[PDB]
Write a protein that holds these residues in place. Structure first.
Motif, PDB file in Angstrom:
ATOM      1  N   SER A 132       0.838  -1.180   0.000  1.00 43.08           N
ATOM      2  CA  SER A 132       0.000   0.000   0.000  1.00 43.08           C
ATOM      3  C   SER A 132       0.875   1.233   0.000  1.00 43.08           C
ATOM      4  O   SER A 132       2.041   1.177   0.397  1.00 43.08           O
ATOM      5  CB  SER A 132      -0.979   0.001   1.171  1.00 43.08           C
ATOM      6  OG  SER A 132      -0.296   0.196   2.390  1.00 43.08           O
ATOM      7  N   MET A 133       0.332   2.334  -0.492  1.00 40.92           N
ATOM      8  CA  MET A 133       1.058   3.582  -0.538  1.00 40.92           C
ATOM      9  C   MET A 133       0.452   4.523   0.496  1.00 40.92           C
ATOM     10  O   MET A 133      -0.773   4.580   0.638  1.00 40.92           O
ATOM     11  CB  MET A 133       0.930   4.169  -1.947  1.00 40.92           C
ATOM     12  CG  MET A 133       1.670   5.451  -2.160  1.00 40.92           C
ATOM     13  SD  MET A 133       1.811   5.815  -3.935  1.00 40.92           S
ATOM     14  CE  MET A 133       0.089   5.834  -4.483  1.00 40.92           C
ATOM     15  N   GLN A 134       1.293   5.212   1.239  1.00 37.03           N
ATOM     16  CA  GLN A 134       0.847   6.203   2.201  1.00 37.03           C
ATOM     17  C   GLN A 134       1.690   7.419   1.912  1.00 37.03           C
ATOM     18  O   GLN A 134       2.894   7.416   2.203  1.00 37.03           O
ATOM     19  CB  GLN A 134       1.073   5.749   3.649  1.00 37.03           C
ATOM     20  CG  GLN A 134       0.646   6.848   4.637  1.00 37.03           C
ATOM     21  CD  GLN A 134       0.897   6.507   6.084  1.00 37.03           C
ATOM     22  OE1 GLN A 134       1.540   5.519   6.412  1.00 37.03           O
ATOM     23  NE2 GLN A 134       0.378   7.326   6.981  1.00 37.03           N
ATOM     24  N   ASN A 135       1.095   8.433   1.253  1.00 39.06           N
ATOM     25  CA  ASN A 135       1.804   9.644   0.871  1.00 39.06           C
ATOM     26  C   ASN A 135       2.993   9.259  -0.065  1.00 39.06           C
ATOM     27  O   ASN A 135       2.747   8.506  -1.007  1.00 39.06           O
ATOM     28  CB  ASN A 135       2.153  10.485   2.123  1.00 39.06           C
ATOM     29  CG  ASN A 135       0.924  10.824   2.928  1.00 39.06           C
ATOM     30  OD1 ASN A 135      -0.049  11.360   2.400  1.00 39.06           O
ATOM     31  ND2 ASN A 135       0.918  10.501   4.212  1.00 39.06           N
ATOM     32  N   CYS A 136       4.253   9.622   0.248  1.00 41.26           N
ATOM     33  CA  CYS A 136       5.389   9.258  -0.594  1.00 41.26           C
ATOM     34  C   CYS A 136       6.161   8.014  -0.123  1.00 41.26           C
ATOM     35  O   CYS A 136       7.259   7.758  -0.624  1.00 41.26           O
ATOM     36  CB  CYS A 136       6.314  10.455  -0.778  1.00 41.26           C
ATOM     37  SG  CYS A 136       5.479  11.912  -1.426  1.00 41.26           S
ATOM     38  N   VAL A 137       5.571   7.227   0.794  1.00 38.17           N
ATOM     39  CA  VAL A 137       6.164   5.988   1.245  1.00 38.17           C
ATOM     40  C   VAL A 137       5.323   4.797   0.809  1.00 38.17           C
ATOM     41  O   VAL A 137       4.094   4.842   0.799  1.00 38.17           O
ATOM     42  CB  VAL A 137       6.523   5.911   2.762  1.00 38.17           C
ATOM     43  CG1 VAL A 137       7.646   6.871   3.104  1.00 38.17           C
ATOM     44  CG2 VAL A 137       5.315   5.976   3.682  1.00 38.17           C
TER      45      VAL A 137
END
Ligand SMILES: O=C1N(c2cncc3ccccc23)CC[C@]12CCOc1ccc(Cl)cc12
Ligand SMILES: O=C1N(c2cncc3ccccc23)CC[C@]12CCOc1ccc(Cl)cc12
Ligand SMILES: [Cl-]
Lengths: 305, 297
Positions: free
Chosen positions: A81-86
């Motif tokens: 999963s992506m959370q912002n730029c991480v």
């Protein structure tokens, strides 16, 4: 005695460093419990960097496209999963070396240790500060992306930075561990530049109190200043404004040395006007701004020389 | 890009740090296999003081666990405490004696608990400009080559000028120092010339070239200048060692010496090199090559 730019011991962080590979891109990841955290630009090619659509690039990936290596062992990715730029890669093994930790977002002026890594292998540790322009003056080569910044007050690791990019002036930009960038930067190869940087005034004052604690008083004077007059002079040398918060924070160092914050502010004003005249302060010929009031208290003796 | 004073990752050394207590003295020990190494001054004529001690007088604590001392012996200024448990975290290691000018990482410790890591150099006067408070004795200096930890320093004392003195891991002091309270002082120090040259090559690699000039010098003329400014003599071995950096930047070692001579005779004139207004001598030619290549451990 002595005063060094000291980093936290890196062992607790070394046991979390892994290598993440997606296609031709290889960078570093942080393995905590059953999740590997890394910059989302691992899914990009060089061409993609101009205007990457990360949601579009990510939807085309499956779990088995991400290769994660911890030492000589291959970890299996079971979710992403992506959370912002991480990017957060769920793995099938919890890290047995996971320390007690927190994710903390720091403010400009705060310091932290960086464990520089390449191919999931740590190469060095150094101390640095989040500059007022939200960049860090680090030492990073290509392949260092995903290297992390942290503090270890007591036995808990507070992760505060993950490395993403180098700006044209040779300075570095990155995110907190929730993927939010520090400053106005984007993980795009668009024309971006560090803003004009300034000196961290509260840190220079803390370092002047460290010099007094270690036995040096040559720079003191018989003058005092108002906070407003100090800020009018400070701004002319590209120094950050000193707030009432900073004055409050310097309270303990002021009580230990017997030098009022506004009296130390008067020595700083004079140092800016005169320079050092062949002298040094704690072995430096420049005014040092990468030690916080908290760092000085932690490193220096509680008994003034 | 960037150039920082970088230490080796300290994890392999952290897993060896223990607290040693003998009577009222508490300091740090290094636990490798079934032996704990620590400064012999933890006991206080050291053979006479030691003969009066039994194994149970030495309290050794590794984390929250008490280790049992089953033997003790002295080797020079280091005490070796045989314990009943081998350290399961013992890394691959060697004991090495370093030369002045060489650099190493220090893991500063208090009560057997590591508090910080920093990089430093063995000065030409055999002292180290460290950052140590009371309780730091037994803190160690090391380098890492591949997966092997080379232990080179154990902290013993602070001199009146605020500088530090210690031994190799075989208990031999670096410098003309003794482990006792008497009048001792650091000798006049000098600048590590080969290291300043390496740092000037690091500045060129990072795009700082204002100090370069068209001139060259002989090694003899450079050494006559260097002796005037309290700089260590530069030998042909130093010139050979700087060979790789000279080939990478296209600046001959004696060409960089002419730049250094001009910096010594004229100063920096308001300018900085790698963010410093002083000539930095605590990076060796190997440190510059390693940091500008990303070698891992
Ligand atoms: O800055 C970048 N990299 C680096 C990172 N830290 C140090 C470096 C040193 C030397 C060369 C590159 C380095 C790697 C990815 C890159 C380059 C392309 O342009 C972008 C654009 C956005 C982002 Cl988030 C990252 C990058
Ligand atoms: O130098 C010493 N210690 C220190 C060591 N590193 C930092 C320090 C900072 C501030 C005060 C002391 C410090 C601790 C033990 C002492 C002082 C007593 O007399 C001796 C005599 C011999 C020896 Cl080997 C060591 C010592
Ligand atoms: Cl903060």
């Amino acid at each position: 005695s002595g005063f060094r730019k000291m980093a936290f011991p890196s062992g607790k962080v070394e046991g979390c460093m892994v290598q993440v590979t997606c296609g031709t891109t290889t960078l570093n990841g942080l393995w905590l419990d059953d999740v590997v955290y890394c910059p989302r630009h691992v899914i990009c090619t060089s061409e993609d960097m101009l205007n990457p659509n990360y949601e579009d690039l990510l939807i085309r990936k499956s779990n088995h496209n991400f290769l994660v290596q911890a030492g000589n062992v291959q970890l299996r990715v079971i979710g992403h999963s992506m959370q912002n730029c991480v990017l957060k890669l769920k793995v099938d093994t919890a890290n047995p070396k996971t320390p007690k930790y927190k994710f903390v977002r720091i403010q400009p002026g705060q310091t932290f240790s960086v464990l520089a890594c390449y191919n999931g292998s740590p190469s060095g540790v150094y101390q640095c500060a989040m500059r007022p322009n939200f960049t860090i003056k680090g030492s990073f080569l290509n392949g260092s992306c995903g290297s992390v910044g942290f503090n270890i007050d007591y036995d808990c690791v507070s992760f505060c930075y993950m490395h993403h990019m180098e700006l044209p002036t040779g300075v570095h930009a990155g995110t907190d561990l929730e993927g939010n960038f520090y400053g106005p930067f984007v993980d795009r190869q668009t024309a971006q530049a560090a803003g004009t940087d300034t000196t961290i005034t509260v840190n220079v004052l803390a370092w002047l109190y460290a010099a007094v604690i270690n036995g040096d008083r040559w720079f003191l004077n018989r003058f005092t200043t108002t906070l407003n007059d100090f800020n009018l002079v400070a701004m002319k040398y590209n120094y950050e404004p000193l707030t009432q918060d900073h004055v409050d924070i310097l309270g303990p160092l002021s009580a230990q040395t017997g030098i009022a914050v506004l009296d130390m502010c008067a020595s700083l004003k004079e140092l800016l006007q005169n320079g050092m005249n062949g002298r040094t302060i704690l072995g430096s010929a420049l005014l040092e701004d990468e030690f916080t009031p908290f760092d000085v208290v932690r490193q220096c003796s509680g008994v003034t020389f």
